[PDB]
């Protein structure tokens, strides 16, 4: 399973089971460019969020109701949607994944 494999290898579920996590299959340069695209408010009300002009290939990884450490279980949902990321620093780079529309 891509999600079980990737989450593990990325040290994401090595010491616990992360309930949800999205993976972006676009280049890093192209994802970093979103920080200068459409400004929107994060779900929390913050406004340092940016929505990508176009849709991007992403894979949603969600734990199943049965999942329990050490045996984490994820459902793999591949899709193409706009991504919304929060940006900070200098340069202005993504630091959080807010959502995918």
């Amino acid at each position: 399973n891509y999600c079980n494999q990737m989450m593990k290898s990325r040290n994401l579920t090595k010491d616990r089971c992360k309930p949800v996590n999205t993976f972006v299959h676009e280049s890093l340069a192209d994802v970093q460019a979103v920080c200068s695209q459409k400004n929107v408010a994060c779900k929390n009300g913050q406004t340092n969020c940016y929505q990508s002009y176009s849709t991007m290939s992403i894979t949603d990884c969600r734990e199943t109701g049965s999942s329990k450490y050490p045996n984490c279980a994820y459902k793999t949902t591949q899709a193409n949607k706009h991504i919304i990321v929060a940006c900070e620093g200098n340069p202005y780079v993504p630091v959080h994944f807010d959502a995918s529309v």
């Binding site: 990325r10 280049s27 900070e88 630091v95 994944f97």
Partner: peptide, 15 residues
């Protein structure tokens, strides 16, 4: 060691 931008890359990037 790991910064917020670095953490985002490791957790969400898979070009």
């Amino acid at each position: 060691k790991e910064t917020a931008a670095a953490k985002f890359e490791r957790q969400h990037m898979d070009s």
